[PDB]
Curated annotation (Swiss-Prot), chain A:
UniProt-listed GO biological process terms: symbiont-mediated evasion of host restriction-modification system; symbiont-mediated suppression of host innate immune response
Protein name, UniProt field: Protein Ocr
Superkingdom of source: Viruses
The species this protein was found in: Escherichia phage T7 (Bacteriophage T7)
Protein's job: Prevents both degradation and modification of T7 DNA by the host restriction-modification complex. Structural mimic of the phosphate backbone of B-form DNA that binds to and completely occupies the DNA-binding sites of all known families of the complex type I DNA restriction enzymes. Thereby, inhibits the restriction endonuclease activity and protects the phage genome as it penetrates into host cytoplasm. Inhibits host transcription by binding to the bacterial RNAP and competing with sigma factors. Inhibits the host exclusion defense system BREX.
Assigned keywords, A-Z: Early protein, Host-virus interaction, Inhibition of host innate immune response by virus, Restriction-modification system evasion by virus, Viral immunoevasion
Oligomeric and partner information: Homodimer. Interacts with HsdM (AC P08957), the M subunit of host type I methyltransferase restriction enzyme M.EcoKI; 1 Ocr dimer binds to M.EcoKI. Interacts with HsdR (AC P08956), the R subunit of host type I bifunctional endonuclease and methyltransferase restriction enzyme R.EcoKI; 2 Ocr dimers binds to R.EcoKI. Interacts with host PglX/BrxX (AC P0DUF9); this interaction inhibits the enzymatic activity of PglX/BrxX through high-affinity binding. Forms a 2:2 tetrameric complex with phage T7 OCR.
Sections of the chain in a coiled coil: none
From Swiss-Prot, chain B:
Task performed by this protein: DNA-dependent RNA polymerase (RNAP) catalyzes the transcription of DNA into RNA using the four ribonucleoside triphosphates as substrates. Resistance to the antibiotics salinamide A, salinamide B, rifampicin, streptolydigin, CBR703, myxopyronin, and lipiarmycin can result from mutations in this protein.
Source organism of this protein record: Escherichia coli (strain K12)
Assembly: The RNAP catalytic core consists of 2 alpha, 1 beta, 1 beta' and 1 omega subunit. When a sigma factor is associated with the core the holoenzyme is formed, which can initiate transcription. The rRNA transcription and antitermination complex (rrnTAC) consists of RNAP, NusA, NusB, NusE (rpsJ), NusG, SubB, ribosomal protein S4, DNA and precursor rRNA; S4 is more flexible than other subunits. In pull-down experiments interacts with CedA.
Applications reported: Co-administration of salinamide and rifampicin or salinamide and myxopyronin suppresses the emergence of resistance to both antibiotics.
Domain of life (superkingdom): Bacteria
Protein name (database record): DNA-directed RNA polymerase subunit beta
Originating gene: rpoB
Family assignment from sequence similarity: Belongs to the RNA polymerase beta chain family.
Disulfide pairings: none
PTM text: Acetylated on several lysine residues in the presence of glucose.
Length: 105, 50, 104
């Protein structure tokens, strides 16, 4: 019902995708992070409104190229949640790779 | 009694620039840059309980 | 915020407008219902998405003529919440029109 739970789910999925593939390069971080952001959104209809209801997400857009052309509001809200999750994962991926490199020896 | 809006819309309807919004509406303070001095002007003794 | 508190504030502003205007007719009640649903709107975006997340609301609506055609999402959501508030304040002000006349 809050954004913190879905943020923790995306955090756990990104940690699992770092641990499974063992990626040490910063340029080849495309497919794992994009599939983690695609698999972090909920499939239910009310959960999208529940994520949009809590704090941590706004109405102002960063990139206008990610806006689909449809008459459905729920797809636009899913794209906005996907955009906010990509912002959070691409801002936390460097710190999680630093923690993954400092975890093992 | 209709849908309300913030008063900056009607305030800026008199050809009232955002520079004039952030200058005239509030008493400001100044600061110097570009010289690595990191100084301001004299205090206006405006602080009472902060 | 929840749906119940926003609806309570909605018919609270409606009954304040009725006490201010002294409206007796139902045809004059309906315009007050439209003006009260025009009033009492939240400016917090989180509360607007919390009305859409709470119970007592559906995704599909009956009328599509009131649905605007623009790239603004908040205008479409405000129109949908406005239509829902007009319907709900009519349904719960049909009794309030008799209650106000029976108070004083």
């Amino acid at each position: 019902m809050t954004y913190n739970n879905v943020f923790d789910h995306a955090y756990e999925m990104l940690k699992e995708n770092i641990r499974y593939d063992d990626i040490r390069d910063t340029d080849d971080l495309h497919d794992a992070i994009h599939m983690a952001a695609d698999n972090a959104v909920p499939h239910y209809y009310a959960d999208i409104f529940s994520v949009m209801a809590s704090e941590g997400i706004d109405l102002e857009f960063e990139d206008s190229g990610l806006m689909p052309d449809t008459k459905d509001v729920i797809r636009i809200l899913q794209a906005r949640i996907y955009e906010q999750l990509t912002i959070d994962l691409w801002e936390d991926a460097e710190d999680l790779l630093n923690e993954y490199l400092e975890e093992v020896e | 009694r209709r849908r309300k809006l913030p008063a900056t819309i009607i305030l800026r309807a008199l050809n009232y620039t955002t520079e004039q919004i952030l200058d005239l509406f509030f008493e400001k303070v100044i600061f110097e840059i570009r010289d690595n001095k990191l100084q301001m002007e004299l205090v206006p003794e405006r602080l009472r309980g902060e």
